[PDB]
């Protein structure tokens, strides 16, 4: 029925992102309290999406 008609839509789509830069990229702690020995833990990165 709509061979030569126009069609328009209002649509919902899932949010999506890509990492375009990594910022304040690494933060660190030698956690030692209440451990058998010194341990290295990487704290949260910040991403610019």
């Amino acid at each position: 029925k709509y061979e030569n008609h126009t069609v328009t839509l209002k649509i919902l789509m899932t949010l999506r992102y890509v990492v375009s830069d990594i910022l304040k990229e690494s933060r660190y702690q030698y956690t030692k309290f209440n451990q058998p020995k010194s341990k290295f833990e990487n704290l949260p990165q910040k991403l610019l999406l």
Partner: protein
């Protein structure tokens, strides 16, 4: 402690006037006193003639 945009603050129960577990100890005393006073009534006072 604040490093590189991440910060943390902690305030312990420790203080110059009272230790960190002082609340637990002081509640233990409150129970022991009630518990001990009541139990002494099971045995009673001591008497000796003279």
């Amino acid at each position: 402690l604040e490093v590189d945009g991440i910060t943390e603050t902690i305030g312990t129960t420790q203080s110059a006037m009272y230790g960190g577990a002082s609340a637990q100890i002081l509640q233990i005393n409150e129970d022991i006193k009630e518990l001990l006073d009541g139990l002494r009534a099971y045995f009673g006072y001591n008497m000796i003639g003279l």
